[PDB]
């Protein structure tokens, strides 16, 4: 009848406050339970590895969200650093309620967790993306905590050369939370990519890095760009699309180059072997710094015939274009090379990551797909057809055909209605025409005779903005409504961020305010109880409007068009007293690079933020244990509980 519920992230980060949930089910109106929850148990006696935090729960205050510190000193002293095999630790809640009420042989209930020394966020940037041998590499690393504020903890940084060997190691205490340093590349160093790695001193698992290239180069004065008309070529025999490219070359100060673009063509394989056409080379003089060239279908077919190659062989490979432009009359020459032009069998591509698995028999299934140009951007307004076969509940199978156009950002969201006791669901998706893009998905249904199911329905499929309130509709499915409440919580970045409860009503609706802590991706988990059995379901919500908590806005007041040696007023705006790290690159360095590397940018920061997210897949499961484990949680009620996961991998 009565229950103690313990919720926590499945992975404990040492030095990070661990959010722990505790809750009471079916507890008499006046009854009160008090206790303590704490982290425990290397096989060294049974020593606590954390301070204790006390909880007090009532029938009218039946859930609490607790912050349990897990500090380095106590984790070290208890013996987790001396632990053998995997890094596993226990969370334990201690209350005499288990003795007084449930009559267990213990006053303890817990969960078995994993732990990691990985903590904080480490970012680092370099003087340039590419250097000559013998040149001084300036760089700096930034140390932030889980809360995303500057951290002063000691960090260890190491520089790894093109060969792969450590060339330098520094371990330094951060007063201002930035480490600025410099070193000189060996003059005799081989061209190649160098790698800088940084960790917290206590964080042996705190991987973070940045890379740069060393290459012998002289700084170009213009950049040449090969741009296909479309970054794909249909090799379907029904219509081989015509190859055409806008080739541009432009001085780095903006004006267009005048000169001749000497272009060569061939086929490049996956391994890296490019077989040039002998013939079909194109020589063209730039007009307004551009040259439009094309390869005729007859020329291409003869070139394939020249190589004894058929159009049916071109399911792999890519059409290789390399252009060496010689400036006239200056005589400077630099090359462009295009490796993006795959031979494809459809102009579109289907991404079915969004579509939830393990869906509730008796509730609408939401088919979510992203239609993208093949090697391009999302496809807008493309018609998508879904063929959904509900496999025999004992009656004859039936097929449900629903068609919808991509609303935007490739998003199509189709509600195929799934009836009770479906044996399994088989999904075939066809997007756009000519030459439909196709993908197939099969997913099994919950085992027979479940306690109940929970339908989580999201009316607005748009990624909510930071500051917009998202409303989710929660409906119990499949069993009597003995329960009077359902309980929900918001998980973000691998932490329980919010936990609350909504009483059951006709068409119950729960409001989730999307704050900056929920960016960029969070899980909505909700559950109710049928007798002594938990019923749960989970839904992933991506927040794609992410931006700075404050701001940094760099600007140059004026109309640009500055001359050399003039005064430029660089304006810096922010919302706090901030340490602003600056650096001005000559853009020629991007052109010079054999493999260009994108700078550090806000998308990388948000991606780094969500590397702590324990969540795997879009949510949902056949059982509440699966739902909680899929969300990223560990759970125990005293009878049903979660075994430790195989780390973050989710194999």
């Amino acid at each position: 009848k009565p229950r103690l519920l313990l919720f926590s992230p499945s992975v404990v980060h040492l030095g990070v406050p661990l959010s722990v949930g505790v809750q009471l089910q079916d507890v008499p109106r006046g009854q009160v339970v008090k206790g303590s929850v704490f982290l425990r148990n290397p096989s060294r006696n049974n020593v606590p590895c954390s301070p204790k935090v006390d909880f007090t729960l009532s029938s009218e205050r039946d859930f609490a969200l607790l912050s349990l510190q897990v500090p380095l000193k106590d984790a070290k002293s208890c013996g987790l650093h001396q632990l053998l095999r995997g890094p596993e630790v226990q969370l334990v809640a201690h209350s005499p309620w288990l003795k007084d009420s449930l009559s267990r042989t213990t006053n303890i209930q817990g969960i078995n967790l994993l732990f990691s020394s990985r903590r904080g966020h480490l970012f680092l940037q370099t003087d340039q993306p590419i250097y000559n041998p013998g040149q001084r590499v300036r760089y700096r690393v930034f140390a932030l905590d889980q809360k995303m504020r500057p951290s002063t903890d000691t960090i260890t940084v190491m520089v790894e050369n093109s060969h792969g060997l450590r060339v330098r190691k520094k371990e330094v205490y951060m007063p201002s939370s930035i480490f600025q340093d410099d070193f000189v590349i060996p003059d005799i160093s081989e061209p190649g990519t160098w790698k800088i790695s940084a960790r917290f001193s206590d964080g042996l698992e705190s991987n973070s890095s940045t890379q740069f290239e060393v290459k012998k180069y002289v700084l170009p004065n213009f950049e040449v760009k090969i741009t296909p008309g479309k970054p794909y070529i249909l090799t379907v025999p029904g219509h081989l699309d015509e190859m055409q490219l806008d080739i541009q070359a432009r001085y780095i100060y903006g004006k267009p180059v005048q000169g001749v673009a000497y272009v060569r063509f061939g086929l490049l394989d996956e391994d890296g072997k490019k077989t040039f056409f002998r013939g079909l080379e194109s020589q063209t003089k730039l007009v307004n710094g551009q040259s439009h060239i094309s390869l005729s279908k007859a020329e291409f077919q003869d070139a394939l015939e020249k190589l004894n190659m058929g159009i049916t062989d071109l399911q792999g490979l890519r059409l290789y274009v390399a252009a060496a432009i010689i400036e006239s009359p200056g005589g400077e020459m630099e090359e462009a090379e295009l490796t993006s032009w795959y031979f494809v069998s459809s102009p579109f591509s289907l991404d079915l990551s969004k579509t939830k698995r393990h869906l509730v028999p008796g509730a609408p299934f939401l088919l979510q797909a992203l239609v993208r140009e093949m090697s391009g951007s999302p496809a807008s307004g493309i018609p998508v057809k879904v063929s959904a076969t509900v496999s025999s509940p004992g009656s004859v199978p039936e097929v449900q055909d629903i068609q919808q156009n991509t609303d935007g950002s490739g998003q199509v969201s189709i509600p195929i209605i799934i009836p009770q006791t479906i044996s399994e669901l088989q999904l075939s998706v066809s997007a756009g025409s000519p030459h439909p893009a196709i993908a197939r998905l099969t997913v099994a249904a919950p085992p027979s005779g479940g306690p109940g199911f929970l339908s989580i329905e999201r009316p607005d499929s748009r990624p909510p903005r930071v500051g917009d309130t998202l409303n989710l509709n929660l409906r119990a499915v499949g069993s009597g409504a003995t329960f009077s409440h359902y309980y929900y919580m918001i998980l973000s970045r691998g932490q329980i961020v919010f936990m609350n409860r909504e009483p059951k009503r006709t068409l119950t609706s729960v409001s989730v305010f999307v704050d900056h802590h929920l960016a960029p991706s969070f899980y909505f988990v909700a559950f109710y109880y049928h007798g002594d059995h938990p019923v749960a379901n989970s839904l992933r919500v991506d927040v794609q409007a992410g931006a700075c908590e404050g701001k940094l806005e760099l600007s140059v007041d004026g109309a640009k068009q500055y001359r050399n040696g003039e005064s430029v007023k660089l304006h810096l705006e922010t919302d706090s007293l901030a340490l602003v790290a600056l650096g001005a690159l000559d853009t020629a360095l991007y052109a010079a690079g054999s493999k260009s590397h994108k700078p550090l940018n806000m998308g990388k920061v948000f991606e780094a933020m969500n590397s702590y997210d324990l969540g795997c897949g879009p949510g949902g499961g056949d059982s509440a244990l699966q739902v909680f484990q899929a969300a990223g949680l560990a759970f125990s009620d005293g009878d049903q509980w979660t075994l430790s996961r195989k780390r973050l991998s989710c194999p």
Binding site: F123, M148, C548, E549, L552, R563, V580, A584
Partner: protein, 632 residues
Amino acid sequence: ALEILQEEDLIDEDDIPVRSFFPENWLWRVETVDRFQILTLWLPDSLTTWEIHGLSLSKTKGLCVATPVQLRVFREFHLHLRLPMSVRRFEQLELRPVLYNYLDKNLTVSVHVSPVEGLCLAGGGGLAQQVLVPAGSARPVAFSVVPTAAAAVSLKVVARGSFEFPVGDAVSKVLQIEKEGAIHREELVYELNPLDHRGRTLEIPGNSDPNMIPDGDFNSYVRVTASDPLDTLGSEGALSPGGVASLLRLPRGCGEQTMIYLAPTLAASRYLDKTEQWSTLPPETKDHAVDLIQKGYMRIQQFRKADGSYAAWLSRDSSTWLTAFVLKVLSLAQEQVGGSPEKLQETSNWLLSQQQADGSFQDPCPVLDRSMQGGLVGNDETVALTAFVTIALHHGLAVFQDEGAEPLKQRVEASISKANSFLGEKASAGLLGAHAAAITAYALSLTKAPVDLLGVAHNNLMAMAQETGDNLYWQAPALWIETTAYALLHLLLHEGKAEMADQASAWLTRQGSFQGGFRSTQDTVIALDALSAYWIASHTTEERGLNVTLSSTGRNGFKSHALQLNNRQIRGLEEELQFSLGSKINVKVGGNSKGTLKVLRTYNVLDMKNTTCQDLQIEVTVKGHVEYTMEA
């Protein structure tokens, strides 16, 4: 007519801003910005487009990275000069400055490379070349130069436009002269193995080769790679996770039955501790097990007879075997549960007065059921009991602490020495049973017997040894399971993570896995302790680190470098260091990891034959009459 010139009626160079600052990245400063800041930048002289980093870090708002600002600088009339990476001394090269005119008027410009010390240049650098550049057009103004300097020379190209249109520009840029000869590199490879005496110390010679240029550049680099085994491992372990937890049973009956319940319950708890399988069991099981141990400790001391002896019922005469077994259980339980030490000290003292004149021990009233004793009917019961009491006494020895127990320890350790002497004598004497030999060797190895005694016990067991049916030596009888467990612990104690120990553990684990666990009594208690000890032993031994100490004397005098690729956590770590030196380097190798040492010597070697224009060829001839000024 058409060849008219404007010679020296042009802007006089003094009034031309000369462009000289050409950085590839700049503005690297970090500034404190209190919500707003304005930096009055002074632009560099290179006409390109700049991309500006911006990371804002603050205590209250955290990290913010701005969208980069594009800033491009353009002069509308300018000269661009790409100098090569490096040019050899005394080898002619073509400098190719290009004038760009983006005005709507044709420009006539007089261009010359200013005379500079270290460069040899057409006509001595005084002569200047007029050239006319159409509107919206560019033209190269190639100059041919051969450099005489040995290091670097700043060369200034000056373009003086008409006085009618005072266009003008100047570029001062530093030309790097390549050192005499050409770069060459030799890598010396030496495999490393400081384990035992092989390559612990060695001396590496330099480059004798007289092909080196003496006053050229000289650099040397030392770098080392260590390689651990790539094997996927043969170890098994991890006896069933949940079967061991089914041995936890609260003591019900009187003493012997309590011990039948408590001894596997403690052993299971110790195994689950030692093997770290609590994570795969219900989380509060350890709390329950510890409460069972606490209940067991409280239970057993109610059957404790006159200062430290045990029987199931107080009226019964004390059993030596049970008292030793209870002592072994409660001495280990002392780690989990803070029991009374003095009671254990008394219990060991009582066993001392069960020893005879020599080391032998006897039991005047054994336990009722032989299942506790492993079916020890007949055979080497007295020998096995003597070893068994010695094992129990050794566990009890650790209880002794502080001044009061310093004499108590002394009598026990002397008794242990007499017991050890008897146990080695019995092993020496002849053909004991395998069970007796294994327990005797285990007892001797616990008490760290001298090699004169310990080795004979070890060697005699090998002579006895008989294969069980898979591998190693002792469905299967309880005696085989118990004997193997004693042998496995003896092998581990004698040699850590022994190869023979691996095979014994594999058989014993298989024996343990019958329908989810052992169902037998005495064997299980020993086997759980042995298997857990094996699992700790296999993972405890970790070899890490390689340490290479290098020393030499040379141009930079006495110098020494010690580099170690250990640091406690080897992150696939390989390491390189620079160590320029003379022609001999002394190498001292420490640590315990296989590796490879590479010493790289780089220097300038004689130039050798030309590579260019050995495949492709080009030739050009010019005929006519060229109009010249100031040729004479």
